[PDB]
């Protein structure tokens, strides 16, 4: 796996708030979430809300019948990441009581001024095999690739700020395995 | 183990002090304590006080008969993490002179601007056996899990700051061990 177009964060000459007087634009920086998963079925999500009274918008899938307990742990809020551009990042995390048939990897780097560190190479491989030598098994001949790559925030000359994401590359090697029942 | 709901810290739109003019809300940041322990009995605690004169509140369990020496090491301050919502994090640490039947791990990352760094994965496993191949043994057939995950402080539009905490997931594999006397 790698993030595609890491060099695009060196465009510091396109409607960016200056560092200081006569300066280059602020680059993308602040809160980042880098996350990727490979699985034999949909990623399973647990709902956690920063603020349980947040009205999530139409056309998004969010924890429902949310209570104050939803702000720490509410077991009602279970879902499959079965739809694109639907599950908002801030409400959902991989459910660690499930995902037996998935491997997931995620870093939240918080802070407002936090600098992006993005490594690229075509020489790194992750092994998806568990402690028993078994990788994700693809039910119905389907592979599930899930990603989040919020790189940080873009500050236009106004001073207002937008999340900026990048595409993630996946290369998965699979092999046939016999299984019973 | 992992922290559940790390992505909740991307809510920078819910009564946050703006970074600057027109900007996003300041994310949870600053002092954090991430601790977890697995034992066959209560985690054993040593009291150490920033300030021996502090009045701790009714309903809480804190070092009693504090003296100036309580600000470095007073051996009177011994206790069992035997009750939830009672032992103030700031007064107590694991007592390294005991805890033979527990494994504890913790990080204090202090500072006011310190960014939260939180890793999630279902691929990492801590081994609880000691140098002699023995893990915690569960007296009275009871497993003790202990945790703290103060992620940092949330700054509201007034400038006041609250500690924000998150839940912790534990999965513990146990086996049956014969023991004498």
């Amino acid at each position, epitope marked *: 796996t790698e993030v595609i177009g890491v060099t695009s964060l060196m465009n510091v000459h396109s409607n960016g708030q200056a560092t200081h007087d006569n300066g280059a634009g602020k680059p993308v920086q602040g809160t980042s979430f880098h996350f990727f998963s490979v699985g034999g079925e949909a990623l399973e999500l647990q709902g956690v809300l920063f603020n349980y009274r947040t009205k999530y918008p139409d056309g998004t899938i969010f924890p429902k019948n949310a209570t104050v307990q939803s702000q720490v742990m509410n077991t009602e809020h279970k879902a499959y990441l079965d739809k694109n551009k639907a599950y908002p990042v801030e409400c959902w995390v991989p459910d660690p009581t499930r995902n037996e048939n998935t491997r997931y990897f995620g870093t939240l780097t918080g802070g407002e001024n936090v600098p992006p560190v993005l490594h690229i190479t075509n020489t790194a491989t992750t092994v998806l095999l568990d402690e028993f030598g078994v990788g994700p098994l693809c039910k119905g001949d389907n592979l599930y690739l899930s990603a989040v790559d919020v790189c940080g925030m873009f500050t236009n000359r*106004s001073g*207002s700020q937008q999340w900026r994401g990048l595409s993630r590359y996946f290369k998965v090697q699979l092999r046939k395995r016999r299984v019973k029942n | 183990t992992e922290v559940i709901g790390v992505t909740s810290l991307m809510n920078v739109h819910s009564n946050g002090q703006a970074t600057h003019d*027109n900007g996003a809300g300041k994310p949870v940041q600053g002092t954090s304590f991430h601790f977890f322990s697995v034992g066959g009995e209560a985690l054993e605690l040593q009291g150490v006080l920033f300030n021996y004169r502090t009045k701790y509140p009714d309903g809480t369990i804190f070092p009693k008969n504090a003296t100036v020496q309580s600000q470095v090491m007073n051996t009177e301050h011994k206790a069992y993490l035997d009750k939830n919502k009672a032992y103030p994090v700031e007064c107590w640490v694991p007592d390294p002179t005991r805890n033979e039947n527990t494994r504890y791990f913790g990080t204090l990352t202090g500072g006011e601007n310190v960014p939260p760094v939180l890793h999630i994965t279902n691929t990492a496993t801590t081994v609880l056996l000691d140098e002699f191949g023995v893990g915690p043994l569960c007296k009275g057939d009871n497993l003790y899990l202990s945790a703290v995950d103060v992620c940092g402080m949330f700054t509201n539009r007034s400038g006041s700051q609250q500690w924000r905490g998150l839940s912790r997931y534990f999965k513990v594999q146990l086996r049956k061990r014969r023991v004498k006397n």
Partner: antibody, heavy 123, light 108 residues
């Protein structure tokens, strides 16, 4: 020639509802965020609401939040304002104006306006 | 919210004059400043956006300068259709806020 033509204005009692609409032409309507801006008789201009090209995202001034609903039908090149729970103070000319390009940055200015339609709240 | 103030309340001028109206933001707003003309009973028309860009089809005699708090609209050679009310509007913060207006009448 860009053309914006409001309608639906008139007399309405406090507490009741009126629905404004705007016919837009001479530009690619579904590529533009749109605004309602109002002008009370003899006073200045006050921004009321914006809507995304989508139709799917609305934002509102504090003075009108909870009482107004902006919406659109890009199939019919139509922009709507729905006024509810009205108060005499909401009396004004209500104008249909196109977003100047800055919607996504929250930097609103108005490159084309309609003739306006007069809403009078009175018992 | 940003408060916008305008140069004089009212101004008397005559065809051919150089006319100046100023606008002041209650805080630095960089060049996110806009000028509209409004005739009695009519819809506002955009003259200038980003403090100094001439909206298409607006005559070159209209010009704009300023950055930060202080802004000026300038009509080099005033004409009979330039008699109107002039509004400035900050596009820098939400909500967008307008000046109180500058009415330009005919000097008698």
């Amino acid at each position: 020639e860009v053309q914006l033509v409001e309608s639906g204005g008139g007399v309405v009692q406090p507490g009741r509802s009126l629905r404004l609409s705007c016919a837009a032409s001479g530009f690619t309507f579904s590529s533009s965020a749109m605004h309602w801006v109002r002008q009370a008789p003899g006073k200045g201009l006050e921004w009321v609401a914006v809507i995304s090209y989508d139709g799917n995202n609305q934002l509102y001034a504090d003075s009108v939040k909870g009482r107004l609903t902006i919406s659109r039908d890009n199939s019919k090149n139509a922009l709507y304002l729905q006024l509810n729970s009205l108060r005499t103070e909401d009396t004004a000319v209500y104008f249909c104006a196109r977003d100047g390009g800055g919607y996504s940055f929250g930097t609103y200015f108005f490159d084309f306006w309609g003739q306006g339609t007069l809403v009078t709240v009175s018992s | 919210d940003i408060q916008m103030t305008q140069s004089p309340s009212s101004l008397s001028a005559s065809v051919g004059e150089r006319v100046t109206i100023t606008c002041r933001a209650s805080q630095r707003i960089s060049n996110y400043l806009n000028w509209y003309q409004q005739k009695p009973g009519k819809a506002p028309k955009l003259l200038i956006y980003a403090a100094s860009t001439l909206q298409s089809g607006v005559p070159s005699r209209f010009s704009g300068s300023g950055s930060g708090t202080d802004f000026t609209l300038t009509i080099s050679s005033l004409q009979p259709e330039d008699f109107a009310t002039y509004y400035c509007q900050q596009s820098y913060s939400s909500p967008p806020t307008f000046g109180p207006g500058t009415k330009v009448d005919i000097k008698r």
